[PDB]
């Protein structure tokens, strides 16, 4: 399933500096955030990017879309829970 | 209406001021966390401080029923001349 | 007024370049910016509304204006001693 | 383990006190300073490191109930009952 | 670069309310924050990567007389008013 | 020679007088502007910054006497003398 | 130093400036009131300065008292 | 040995007490300007810098017997009292 | 409704409700210092204090008194209802 | 050995920035550090590995777990000198 | 190695107001923005860079006695009190 | 040739954080300057000599002393200007 990286294009373009909570309310740990501030130190939506496909890879094939559009709830983030949805409901 | 406040967010919130924006946000499901966050992290800077509060707030209110709830509560908030300026805004806009 | 912002300013009390520059038309929300991340600093409150007067309003004709605003509402009294600095 | 907490505890709390608590527990000033200077403009992340470094000199071993006393102390019953709640 | 003598006097000019120049000018808020961690500490930076990436997006647009329209729009002249003058005697 | 004594006149005035005599001296706001976004919490950087933007703007040559006579001209004499002591 | 000890018990725009970032606080719009008053009458002869300025008001009484302080 | 204790002490007593309190004691006002100037809107901050300036620029030696003179060398017995009271709790 | 309850409220009443929750002097002075002009922001932030040391019992009750001994108690109520 | 680097692996995962304290509480230069820091500018992780191969192939023999913990603690580093001590306490049952 | 001890009293001690011992320290200002460049969120590392790059331009001269005149001379007394314990008690 | 590089030094040793402006002005493009910005991301006094160089090379046989100067006056720089003509006067003389 593709989708992801369709819906994966919306998260890198709508959270910018609280991207944290997504990589703490998703599966990944404050020793890979810091690794991911370190590796991008000046952009932001490459460590964004990152951290989502750091937690695909954990993830592997349980998480395929709602437990994207679910894990952006209750990191609150409903808007791009919202526009995640409406990519997957088009195409 | 079903407008999409995402490219309004930078007008409203210039037109609103910083005591008015907290104390809706505080009454519309915002805590004292994320206030203070705001508050500390752009210390010296109101006008990205309005843009702060108001993108968190419509971030966690999500996308259908935000512009129709901002204007029930300005409303209830007795302050409609504002939103009175943001229909026309909007209207103008679009 | 090119580069006359600080030395102006140091005539008129923030009572008075508040009640010009509103007058001119900046946004009551551009004054509470300023009050806010200025607050227990009049010094810097009183340049940065000016400054953005200068901004709003332009560079052309800039001084003819200060002159009718300080002295229309019974305020010559003190409006001369500006022009001997200019 | 209250290593899933941390990131929590920041985000239901301010930072001010959060600073407190953490010099009152034995951390210097130079700790507060580097941590304030590592993210500036950006204090959840330094809530969260504040946090890490008062745990990380406080220790695994029973690092839940001390913390639940040192909060009920200074007065943050509400944050000391909530953090079972979540 | 005659965009670039016009653009060192906006870059020169504006300092903290870059934010109003970059959102009127369609950058979005995302871009905004790439721009802030690119340039922790930098104004005049910032100001640049603003304009460059409004530039970028209008490409053949992007000229002169619709940036200094767009000026004009964002409440501030002065800026506009100088590009135009060193549009005149450049 | 004003170059290695800039410091130390630094951190003799407030940073409301290094701004007002910078601006008397006709720096941009633009300069202030970014100092103050690129040195947040760090009065004395933001102090030694200003003195040194002034000082580029000048010039070595009749360095000491622009500063005596700007300070001199707003009634600050205290400070003033201090510099002359120290330098 | 000095000006907190000349606190003792006691351009208009400098003044209008310090009692609008200060209003809620008597005392420290006082002492910097004070401080720039001193300052501008100039470093030198600043008892003599004070002394006058105190003979002028018909405030003998804080002289009196000032003259304690100082020794 | 007070290194440990700056923030209590600060927290207890007021900024406009602890501002005075320095400005007796050998400071600057090249600093105290410089931390009224930072620390904007908050006055936690700026009384533990104000504390720390002092205990800084007068060394380890000598620190709570200098404290408690120059609280007794005004009118501030009460505040002696209670500085007393926690420290013999404390130890 | 904290910045009706201090525009309602005296300046008097709200520190003698302030006080009726043990509210430290310094903690306070470091809330009216750190908001100038800005009372109502610094009532709010006061109340919240004093909401979060009285904890989650005893605050109606404690509300509800400190009301009774201002003689004030119908004039109280009727914010306590409209939030609640 | 498995005694020693089921240690490692909770030090290349406990510990961020602060990767530079305990290489010096850990009897590593300060040139050493620099060299560290301008060899791996992509890997925090393999910036931390590094940093604790210096001090596990200096003192060989003497590079003890227990050593690690107690120069853990001593760079305060309690809680992850713990998260050590949890492994080697039930890798010590078998 | 005596000197390596006296910068992890002082490198954990003070904190952001190394600008001032550090000028005192005989360190120029294009140093100082090459360290605040070089370390941007490292001001523990910056403070033990501003140490090692006087040190380095003492040589000889970069001795435990004028660290603490120094530290001394620049309103900075615990420190200097802190780093003579350690050094009284070794 | 080497009285070309001593004036290198002085503008090297004098502006740090602000190589932006004198390159903007000594005529680098923005693309050159993100290259040096990405380059040396902690070595501020390489990214002034890699502007000054890329400089030098472009102007070839326009690159002088007094032009230098010339240039860092335009942009706002008149301390390091001060600077850059006394080394220059000193070298006519001992040579």
Redesign the interface.
């Given at each position: 399933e593709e989708d992801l990286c369709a819906a994966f294009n919306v998260i890198?373009?709508?959270?910018?500096?609280?991207w944290?909570?997504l990589a703490?309310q998703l599966k990944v740990?404050?020793?890979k955030?810091?690794?991911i501030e370190?590796?991008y130190?000046?952009?932001?939506?490459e460590r964004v990017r990152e951290s989502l496909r750091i937690w695909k890879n954990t993830e592997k094939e349980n998480a395929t879309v709602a437990h994207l559009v679910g894990a952006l709830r209750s990191c609150?983030?409903?808007?791009?829970?919202?526009?995640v949805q409406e990519v997957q409901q088009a195409r | 209406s079903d407008v999409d406040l995402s490219k309004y967010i930078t007008t409203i919130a210039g037109v609103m001021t910083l005591s008015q924006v907290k104390g809706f946000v505080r009454k519309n499901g915002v805590n004292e966390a994320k206030i203070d966050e705001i508050k500390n992290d752009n210390v010296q800077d109101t006008a990205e401080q309005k843009v702060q509060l108001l993108r968190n707030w419509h971030q966690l209110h999500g996308k259908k029923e935000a512009y129709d709830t901002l204007i029930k509560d300005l409303k209830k908030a007795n302050l409609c001349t504002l939103a009175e300026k943001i229909q026309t805004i909007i209207l103008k806009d679009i």
């Amino acid at each position: 399933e593709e989708d992801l990286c369709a819906a994966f294009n919306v998260i890198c373009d709508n959270v910018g500096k609280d991207w944290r909570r997504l990589a703490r309310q998703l599966k990944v740990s404050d020793t890979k955030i810091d690794s991911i501030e370190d590796r991008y130190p000046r952009n932001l939506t490459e460590r964004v990017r990152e951290s989502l496909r750091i937690w695909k890879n954990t993830e592997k094939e349980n998480a395929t879309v709602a437990h994207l559009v679910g894990a952006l709830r209750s990191c609150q983030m409903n808007l791009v829970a919202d526009l995640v949805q409406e990519v997957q409901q088009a195409r | 209406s079903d407008v999409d406040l995402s490219k309004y967010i930078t007008t409203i919130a210039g037109v609103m001021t910083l005591s008015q924006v907290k104390g809706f946000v505080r009454k519309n499901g915002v805590n004292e966390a994320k206030i203070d966050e705001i508050k500390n992290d752009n210390v010296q800077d109101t006008a990205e401080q309005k843009v702060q509060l108001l993108r968190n707030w419509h971030q966690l209110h999500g996308k259908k029923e935000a512009y129709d709830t901002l204007i029930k509560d300005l409303k209830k908030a007795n302050l409609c001349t504002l939103a009175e300026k943001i229909q026309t805004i909007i209207l103008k806009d679009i």
